Amino acid sequence: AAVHLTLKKIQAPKFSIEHDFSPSDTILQIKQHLISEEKASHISEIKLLLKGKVLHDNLFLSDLKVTPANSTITVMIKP
């Protein structure tokens, strides 16, 4: 059952985008999505956080225990 995530980048220039992922997707897949959306060029440029926790690539989305449609992943990008 899909997880509707918001991906919010606060570093100027900010963005906020949305996408449905599977609970069985990994953090790596969310970074791969960001590259598909041309927000970055390589996964190494991207950090993702849930609240103050930096999320490692191997984590499964279901491990985050986010809500089905109300949660936001913070995006840090260093080119």
């Binding site: 606060i10 100027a12 956080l49």
Partner: protein
């Protein structure tokens, strides 16, 4: 005499003062909010626990003793 946890809580308390009082742009408040969550996570306390931590008589008294030497 402050522990690194107490110092972290003071720092979170300072940024919270700025955000609560709207002493910064909305984008800057968003950045400090991320920073406060990261600090809280790093030092092992809940952000909502900070007031309680700094509010103990014991902390106030020890910190006062540090100040008065």
């Amino acid at each position: 005499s402050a522990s690194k946890e107490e110092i972290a809580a003071l720092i979170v308390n300072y940024f919270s003062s700025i955000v609560e009082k709207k002493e910064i742009s909305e984008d800057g408040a968003d950045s400090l909010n991320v920073a406060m969550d990261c600090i809280s996570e790093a030092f092992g306390f809940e952000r909502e626990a900070v007031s309680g931590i700094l509010g103990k008589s014991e902390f106030k008294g020890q910190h006062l003793a540090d100040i008065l030497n």
